[PDB]
């Protein structure tokens, strides 16, 4: 048994997309089907379900209105078209075996699920600032400095400490996705507090998706 | 109709481990069918086991036998319980509900086969720099590395009264020494942060919390 | 997509996976269809003839399918669709009152 | 108001399965076997011994 989604993608507040789901490897004409969302970090949410012959179907508050379900059992292919795309769409779409049986339920198999991705803003290049100690704990002479990227849209931005000297003890961390709809990062390096005044602490910050290589005095 | 998991759960191979789902007062734990479902990390939710009683139920396509369940109508919480842990059985489980048309999931337990001494989370915060002040803005970062299994609570706090606004929290994610980073962010106008004497990072990890400061001074 | 007096909005991939004859362009004199086998199927071949039949028409089966999707019309030639969400932003600086003499 | 319009495509997409068979003319004929039949060949006679 095999479950393909397809039809997602990016889209922007509002608009419309259309999802795919090409079922094999069982009789795809006798089965229930819905469709399950597990939004980036999030547990399951049910959207939809649409029974095997196609006659009554089911949708979630949180979508009722604006998505709607169909099915060509002709063809093994199951469908979820979402109109007036919100921020809360954006997720992974699984598609599932919704079953009906005497007495017994469930989504039997899942598919590997495919990624929609609603965002209002277009392109946008970071913005980077120094974090200094400011306090000295002393644990073995052990300070702790780094820098903070704020607000980029695409996600690779790499990251280095005084152009690749500075590798011993750095830490760059996993990025946020803020309600802005833009990512921040931060990157911290443990520094001996013997070269606090002598050694140049700098930071080495690289976003090729707008061409932006910013290096700020950390 | 609310079905309730702890975010998290903890144990060595060998127990018998036991993930609830307490069932809100909508519904009677004893009449439901219940439903659920393993997740691993970089795959699809995997049918795990299907339960009304001990006489009706199912396990998933190649689930060991160690896996069973049960229900305690006094909490009208149902349970999924693992026989004889083994690595293998760390994911994520969620159990799941069919009430009139509805297909309600619960919160989801992450469970942990203990593979380590659990590691005390190693905090550091920072304030904000003096750049993006005279630029208007004041964010503050607070930074978790190091940390066992990828589980923490942060709370923000400022003169004593509990902020829930400019936060974005980063999930759990494992590094290179097999533990889990995570970082918080607090996000701020530069009036906004003079306002206040001081703040704090106030993270938990096993009801034990660790808690750093910054002032303005 | 235009069906018979009624209209709809199609996306793209959908519309280019429909299992139906077709050709590309407007007419201009016997237009060539494509994949003419969607709607007609040969059965039951005995040796010196095999029958065959037209499948019948396909406007429930598409209806069906573009069901929940963002409707239209036409008429005038240009006459489009009812969907919303206009986001504006109005001065009112030129904006007098009249009569407050 | 308006009418949906012809159901032909709908239904006979949904009939697609089941074993079925065509009539002319007001006699339902039928393709399907199994027909457990015994026979007595007692007074069957042959035509060429001699």
């Known amino acids: 048994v095999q479950l393909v989604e397809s039809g997602g993608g990016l889209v922007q507040p509002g608009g419309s997309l259309r999802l795919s789901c090409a079922a094999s490897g069982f009789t795809f004409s006798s089965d229930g089907m819905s469709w399950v969302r597990q939004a980036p970090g999030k547990g399951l949410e049910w959207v939809s379900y649409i029974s095997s012959g196609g006659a009554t179907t089911y949708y979630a508050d949180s979508v009722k209105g604006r998505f709607t379900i169909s099915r060509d059992n002709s063809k093994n292919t199951l469908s979820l078209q979402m109109n007036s795309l919100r921020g809360e769409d954006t997720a992974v779409y699984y598609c599932?075996?919704?079953?009906?049986?005497?007495?017994?339920?469930?989504?039997?198999?899942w598919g590997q699920g495919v990624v929609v991705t609603v965002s209002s803003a277009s392109t946008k290049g970071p913005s980077v600032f120094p974090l200094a100690p400011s306090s000295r704990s002393t644990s073995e002479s052990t300070a702790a400095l780094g820098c903070l990227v704020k607000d980029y849209f695409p996600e690779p931005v790499t990251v280095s400490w005084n152009s690749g000297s500075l590798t011993s003890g750095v830490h760059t961390f996993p990025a946020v996705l803020q309600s802005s709809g833009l990512y921040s990062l931060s990157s911290v390096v443990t520094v001996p507090s013997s070269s606090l005044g002598t050694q140049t602490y700098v930071c080495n910050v690289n976003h090729k998706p707008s061409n932006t290589k910013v290096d700020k005095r950390v | 109709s609310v079905l309730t998991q702890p975010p998290s759960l903890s144990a060595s191979p060998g127990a018998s481990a036991r993930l609830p789902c307490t069932l809100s007062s909508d519904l009677n734990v004893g009449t439901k069918n219940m439903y659920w479902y393993q997740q691993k990390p970089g795959s699809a939710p995997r049918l795990f086991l299907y339960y009304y009683s001990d006489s009706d139920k199912q396990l998933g396509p190649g689930v060991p036998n160690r896996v069973s369940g049960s229900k305690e109508t006094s909490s009208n919480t149902a349970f999924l319980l693992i026989s004889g842990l083994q690595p293998e059985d760390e994911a994520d489980y969620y159990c799941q509900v069919y009430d009139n048309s509805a297909r309600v999931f619960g919160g989801g337990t992450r469970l942990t086969v203990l593979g380590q001494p659990k590691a005390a989370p190693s905090v550091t915060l920072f304030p904000p720099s003096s750049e993006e002040l005279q630029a208007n803005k004041a964010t503050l970062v607070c930074l978790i590395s190091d940390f066992y299994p990828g589980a923490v609570e942060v709370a923000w706090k400022a003169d004593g009264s509990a902020v829930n606004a400019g936060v974005e929290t980063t999930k759990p994610s494992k590094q290179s020494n097999n533990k889990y980073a995570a970082s918080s962010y607090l996000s701020l106008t530069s009036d906004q942060w003079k306002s206040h004497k001081s703040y704090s990072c106030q993270v938990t990890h096993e009801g034990s919390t660790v808690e750093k400061t910054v002032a303005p001074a | 997509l235009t069906m018979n007096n009624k209209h709809w909005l199609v996306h793209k991939e959908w519309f280019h996976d429909i299992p139906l004859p077709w050709h590309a362009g407007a007419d201009t004199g016997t237009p060539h269809w494509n994949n003419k086998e969607a709607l007609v199927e040969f059965k039951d071949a005995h040796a010196k003839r095999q029958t065959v039949v037209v499948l019948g028409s396909q406007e429930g089966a598409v209806h069906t399918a573009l069901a929940g999707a963002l409707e239209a019309e036409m008429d005038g030639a240009k006459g489009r669709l009812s969907s919303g969400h206009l986001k504006c932003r109005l001065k009112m600086d030129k904006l007098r009152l009249k009569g407050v003499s | 108001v308006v009418v949906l319009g012809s159901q032909e495509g709908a239904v006979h997409t949904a009939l697609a399965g089941a074993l079925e068979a065509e009539m002319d003319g007001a006699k339902g004929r039928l393709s399907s076997g199994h027909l457990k039949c015994r026979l007595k060949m007692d007074k069957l006679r042959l035509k060429g011994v001699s």
């Open positions: 599932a075996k919704d079953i009906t049986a005497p007495g017994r339920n469930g989504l039997d198999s």
